[PDB]
Design an enzyme around this catalytic site. Structure first.
Site, PDB file in Angstrom:
ATOM      1  N   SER A  94      27.702   0.402 -13.971  1.00 21.60           N
ATOM      2  CA  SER A  94      28.175   1.034 -14.519  1.00 21.60           C
ATOM      3  C   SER A  94      29.214   1.708 -14.544  1.00 21.60           C
ATOM      4  CB  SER A  94      27.808  -0.247 -16.249  1.00 21.60           C
ATOM      5  OG  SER A  94      27.127  -1.423 -16.467  1.00 21.60           O
ATOM      6  N   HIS A 108      37.199  -1.796 -15.500  1.00 22.29           N
ATOM      7  CA  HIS A 108      35.881  -1.895 -16.186  1.00 22.29           C
ATOM      8  C   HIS A 108      35.327  -2.256 -15.123  1.00 22.29           C
ATOM      9  CE1 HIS A 108      32.762  -4.489 -17.935  1.00 22.29           C
ATOM     10  NE2 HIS A 108      31.449  -3.068 -17.757  1.00 22.29           N
ATOM     11  N   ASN A 110      30.945  -3.635 -13.148  1.00 23.66           N
ATOM     12  CA  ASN A 110      29.356  -3.611 -13.631  1.00 23.66           C
ATOM     13  C   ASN A 110      29.040  -4.373 -12.290  1.00 23.66           C
ATOM     14  OD1 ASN A 110      27.136  -3.847 -15.909  1.00 23.66           O
ATOM     15  ND2 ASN A 110      26.714  -5.269 -14.190  1.00 23.66           N
ATOM     16  N   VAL A 111      27.535  -4.056 -11.988  1.00 24.18           N
ATOM     17  CA  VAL A 111      26.748  -5.013 -10.888  1.00 24.18           C
ATOM     18  C   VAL A 111      25.610  -4.787 -11.320  1.00 24.18           C
ATOM     19  CG1 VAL A 111      28.978  -5.634  -9.107  1.00 24.18           C
ATOM     20  CG2 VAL A 111      27.342  -3.303  -9.285  1.00 24.18           C
ATOM     21  N   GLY A 260      16.580   1.346 -27.178  1.00 23.89           N
ATOM     22  CA  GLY A 260      15.806   1.959 -26.659  1.00 23.89           C
ATOM     23  C   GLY A 260      16.760   2.961 -25.736  1.00 23.89           C
ATOM     24  N   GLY A 261      18.159   1.859 -25.010  1.00 23.52           N
ATOM     25  CA  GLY A 261      18.960   2.933 -24.006  1.00 23.52           C
ATOM     26  C   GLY A 261      18.744   3.884 -24.284  1.00 23.52           C
TER      27      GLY A 261
END
Lengths: 302, 304
Positions: A94, A108, A110-111, A260-261
């Site tokens: 990301s 931006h 993301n994969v 909780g990341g």
């Protein structure tokens, strides 16, 4: 189990991070990405790479994460109740790039891949991702080129693939309470598992390559455009819109922070500086106004 | 209901005067800028008066808002916590404010007092008050934090021995960013669903809270507005204001509800700071006054 397919995806994602970071470093020429590698208790970890105060990139993050869990996070259970008790792995890259120069769009990409192990069944899995462009002082040709790269990369996978995922991008990156798109669009997809695994994997590889093919030429073309303090002011007010989307609307961000990341890895997307003003709007009939009046509402670039 | 209609009007009158009085007090402290009023009307019933001050000698960005909205049936987002009254005629009214001073040595502050009423055919109306106030320092001072809480404790006292304890506690629980393990500020009072006492007692309580905000915050503004400060301290203030934006956009229920239910966006988002910064792994330097905010002030949670 899909242990070997997942290792292949992981190796791809790590190389993608390296390649994107190298390309952005070459454009900047002053700053380099600094790597922060981290782990979570019985939950995998990640490699967060950040660039700050470059000649070109004011704030940029390119993150790799690989998360493990026994059972899904509670927030995942409303969307995926059937696999709430499953062992899972999630992995992805990301990134968000915020240039110094207002004439270079924010972007931006993301994969990602999610895999859930099932008792007495084949695992469940799907890919997600995309990329998108968030200009301040947009240029017709750049918007067209960005979408042409996106369309071209989809062509080998199906005649309606660009149309579907371009549309999805327009629907997803929208601020309903302001009736305003975040940017000029790109591609967005999730729950991608309708094709065989290998085709899905080839597609996400195409998307990753596509990000660089779409964005890097625009950075090269616009980074040296002359600009003013007043254009930076507009950029900062516009970045308030960006922060709003990520903090109020974006599902990935919300999920990450709820479950909780790693906060600082998640919130790399936030702008270096943002402004908010009561009823703030750009002055009518200016290039600033044309962003929202024309560029964000066109929704047809190729 | 006759008694409720009458009572509700008394609450509205109080709120309108509270807005006037708070704006007057803040204009007096600033001396340069004045509040500009934006009157608006809602499609479906009612409206509000949004008052904003900008680029003053003391208040960089301040919003003091009044709203009174009403209609047939609750918004869709209200149909989850309160499904039994989803088809009710309702009224909601309140004053909500956030003040962002120019000088980092004056804390940001927030206050709210509000009433919700839903009328029920053949049944007594459902109602509750909510609100409170809280302080968000950058360069905090022991005495100011103590004084702020003492005003809160004192106003609560006649309402009961456990009132300050409960609503101070609730304030600490609510104004917390769990993913950063960090309080928004040094606390104050927070309450919602307040209908445990007779209506008149609840109303007198919110009146005491509204007055209390001025008694708690204005002396602090007066005491700190002329403290010398540097561009570096403004930089800190702006990074700290990123935390404030995060709370309001990610966590705050009122903000979330307003934005998802068709509230007036610019009125709702007056809470956002004029300027905010975010940096990857940004923290203040250790052993500095900047660090002492998060190391001491935000974790003390015992002021009186």
């Amino acid at each position: 189990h899909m242990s070997l397919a997942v290792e292949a995806v992981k190796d791809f994602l790590l190389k993608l991070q390296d390649d994107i970071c190298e390309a952005l470093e070459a454009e900047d020429g002053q700053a380099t990405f600094v790597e922060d590698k981290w782990t979570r208790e019985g939950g995998g970890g990640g490699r967060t790479r950040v660039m700050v105060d470059g000649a070109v990139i004011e704030k940029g993050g390119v993150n790799f994460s690989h998360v493990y869990g026994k059972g899904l996070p509670m927030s995942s259970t409303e969307r995926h109740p059937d696999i709430a008790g499953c062992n899972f792995e999630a992995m992805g890259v990301s990134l968000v790039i915020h240039p110094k120069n207002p004439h270079v769009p924010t972007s931006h990409a993301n994969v990602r891949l999610f895999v859930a192990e099932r008792e007495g069944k084949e695992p469940v899995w799907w890919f997600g991702g995309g990329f998108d462009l968030t200009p301040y002082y947009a240029v017709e040709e750049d918007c067209r080129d960005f979408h042409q790269v996106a369309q071209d990369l989809c062509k080998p996978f199906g005649a309606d693939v660009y149309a579907r995922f371009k549309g999805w991008c327009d629907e997803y990156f929208f601020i309903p309470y302001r009736n305003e798109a975040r940017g000029i669009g790109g591609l967005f997809f999730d729950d991608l598992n309708e094709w065989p695994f290998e085709k899905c994997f080839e597609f996400v590889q195409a998307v990753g390559k596509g990000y660089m093919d779409a964005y890097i030429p625009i950075v090269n073309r616009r980074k040296n455009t002359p600009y003013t303090e007043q254009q930076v002011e507009f950029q900062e007010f516009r970045r308030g819109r960006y922060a709003e989307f990520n903090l109020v609307i974006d599902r990935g961000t919300k999920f990450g922070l709820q479950s909780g990341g790693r906060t600082e890895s998640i919130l790399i997307s936030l702008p270096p500086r943002a402004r908010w003003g009561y009823n703030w709007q750009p002055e009518p009939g200016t290039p600033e106004a044309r962003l929202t009046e024309y560029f964000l509402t066109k929704r047809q670039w190729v």
